[PDB]
Structures are given as structure tokens and as C-alpha cells.
Design an enzyme around this catalytic site. Structure first.
Site, PDB file in Angstrom:
ATOM      1  N   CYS A  58      33.296 -43.221  68.772  1.00 20.73           N
ATOM      2  CA  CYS A  58      32.941 -41.821  68.498  1.00 20.73           C
ATOM      3  C   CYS A  58      32.951 -40.935  69.718  1.00 20.73           C
ATOM      4  CB  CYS A  58      31.569 -41.711  67.783  1.00 20.73           C
ATOM      5  SG  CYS A  58      30.069 -42.128  68.735  1.00 20.73           S
ATOM      6  N   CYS A  65      31.229 -37.885  68.530  1.00 19.66           N
ATOM      7  CA  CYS A  65      29.898 -37.822  69.120  1.00 19.66           C
ATOM      8  C   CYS A  65      30.030 -37.595  70.636  1.00 19.66           C
ATOM      9  CB  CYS A  65      29.121 -39.103  68.797  1.00 19.66           C
ATOM     10  SG  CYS A  65      29.636 -40.473  69.852  1.00 19.66           S
TER      11      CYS A  65
END
Ligand SMILES: O=c1c2ncn3c2ncn1[C@@H]1O[C@H](COP(=O)(O)OP(=O)(O)OCC2O[C@@H]3[C@H](O)C2O)[C@@H](O)[C@H]1O
Length: 252
Positions: A75, A157
Site C-alpha cells: 500500500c 497508504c
């Protein structure tokens, strides 16, 4: 045959064989996708657009394919791009520092391809397909990319990077997939920073393009989402790639 139904290029030749082959190749190389049944993937891909009016495609049409194409991506190492895919791809290919959508099974399957069907027949249309601008935006190709790009952005992320083409009139284009889908689907709960790398085309002595009005717009949009914005100029993309390959170099 001197005039086609739609304004865009028809389905890529041997589309079914190409998708199937790409899926076999991907699943052979990538161990985490080693179990995927590529016939099932093709069946789901087909199901999204065959026998359907090619101006009436929905994200729901692609859900069976999305399910089969379920894939974990690191991520914190996502690379987004707009209008500069060749450099983005050359970059990630060196040592897999980052991952683009084309590094995923679904992105890999569809990259550079065009496809569409016909209402109430099971035939692929190899003659023409709807153009997003002239014909309809809800076409098989456009709807596919919006769907997969949304999911990809949602998975990001930490620090997410984006490569932008600084030779374009609009370095950040609000109408691009990046600007209309990905920016609005990054999750502020998870994404700390969006860092843009603005790639110069004005070759060999140029301006600070992080001050460009479209970059300031992007900064404003993402800041108002409670995500930090950073920007860097890449003045000489040739030097950049060389430094990635061999960071043990004087200028790097
Ligand atoms: O990976 C692709 C991709 N591969 C091929 N294509 C992609 N589109 C979006 N993406 C995703 O959106 C952006 C790029 O789309 P864009 O901003 O419209 O650039 P762009 O304008 O260069 O994208 C042109 C483009 O090329 C097709 C798609 O049909 C489409 O619209 C990337 O971050 C990707 O994650």
C-alpha cells in the site's frame, strides 16, 4: 464499411487470445496470483461487455472480474501517473521500487487494449468502439479503467507518488483519470502525503513547474482532503533513470 457505427478504434485484434495469454503470463510470473484460473478470468471479463450495449456499461458489469482479480498491493509503494506512462513503467521496472496499476493482474491484462460488444448479439466488435468524447463515456474501456483505478487508489497508504507530464498545457488535468477518479479516492485515514514528480520536457534548463497554476490547484484539492502535498521537479528524466539504475554515480 466505408462508415463505422462508432467513432473510436475497434476491438484489438485477437482480443480473447491476448487477454488469456497475458493472464497465463502474469500468473506464471507472480506467485501470489499463481492459483488464478485464467479461463474464469476471461469468462468474467467477457461477461462484463458481451451482448451489452457498449454505451450502457456500468461498474457492476465488471464486479465478477474485479472479484477474480482480487490482489494485495504493497500500500505504501504505489505510483500513480498522468500522461507519462512510459517513464512510470521504465522506473518501476528497474528494481520494483514502486508499483503502478499496470503491475497488477487487471491493469496488465487491459493495458493498451480496446474492446466492445454489441447489444443482443454475442459478437465482439472489431470494426469500431465508442469514443469517450464523441459517442459515450459509459463504454467498456472507459468504465473498466475508472473501476480499476478507483480500487487501486483506495488501496494506497502512507506516501503515494504521482508522475506528471510537465510538457503538457495542463500538468495536472482535473479531467484525467488521475484528477477525476484517483485523487478523490485516496483515503485520508490512510494516506499521509501525495508527492508529485513533475517530469520536464523543456529540455535542459527550465522553470520551477511546482509553481504552475494547475499544480497549485492539485495542492489545494488534496490539502482540503486532509492529505499533505509535496512536489519535486525532475528536470532531466534521462539522468533520473540512470541514477535509479546506478545511484553510485557522481551527479546523482
Ligand atoms: O493505469 C492506467 C491506465 N493504463 C492504460 N490506461 C490507463 N488509464 C488510467 N490508469 C490509471 O489512472 C492513471 C492514469 O490515467 P490518466 O490520468 O487518464 O492518464 P492518461 O490520460 O495518460 O490515460 C490515458 C488512458 O490509457 C488507458 C486508459 O484507457 C486511458 O484513459 C494512473 O494513475 C493509473 O493508475
Amino acid at each position: 464499411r466505408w462508415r463505422q457505427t462508432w467513432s473510436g478504434p475497434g476491438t484489438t485484434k485477437r482480443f480473447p487470445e491476448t487477454v488469456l495469454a497475458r493472464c497465463v503470463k502474469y500468473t506464471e510470473i507472480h506467485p501470489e496470483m499463481r492459483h488464478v484460473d485464467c479461463q474464469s478470468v476471461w469468462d468474467a471479463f467477457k461477461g462484463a461487455f458481451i451482448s451489452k450495449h457498449p454505451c450502457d456499461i456500468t461498474e457492476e458489469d465488471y464486479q465478477p472480474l474485479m472479484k477474480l482479480g482480487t490482489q494485495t498491493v504493497p500500500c505504501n509503494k504505489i505510483l500513480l501517473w498522468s500522461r507519462i506512462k512510459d517513464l512510470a513503467h521504465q522506473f518501476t521496472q528497474v528494481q520494483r521500487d514502486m508499483f503502478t496499476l499496470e503491475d497488477t493482474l487487471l491493469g496488465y491484462l487491459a493495458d493498451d487494449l480496446t474492446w466492445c460488444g454489441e447489444f443482443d448479439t454475442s459478437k465482439i466488435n472489431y470494426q469500431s468502439c465508442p469514443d469517450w468524447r464523441k459517442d459515450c463515456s459509459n463504454n467498456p474501456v472507459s468504465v473498466f479503467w475508472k473501476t480499476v483505478s478507483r480500487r487501486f487508489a483506495e488501496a494506497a497508504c502512507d506516501v503515494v507518488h504521482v508522475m506528471l507530464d510537465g510538457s503538457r498545457s495542463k500538468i495536472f488535468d482535473k479531467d484525467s483519470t488521475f484528477g477525476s477518479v484517483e485523487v478523490h479516492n485516496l483515503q485520508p485515514e490512510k494516506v499521509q502525503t501525495l508527492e508529485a514528480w513533475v517530469i520536464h520536457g523543456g529540455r535542459e534548463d527550465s522553470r520551477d513547474l511546482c509553481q504552475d497554476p494547475t499544480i497549485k490547484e492539485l495542492e489545494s484539492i488534496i490539502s482540503k482532503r486532509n492529505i499533505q502535498f509535496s512536489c519535486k521537479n525532475i528536470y532531466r528524466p534521462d539522468k533520473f533513470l540512470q541514477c535509479v539504475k546506478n545511484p553510485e554515480d557522481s551527479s546523482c
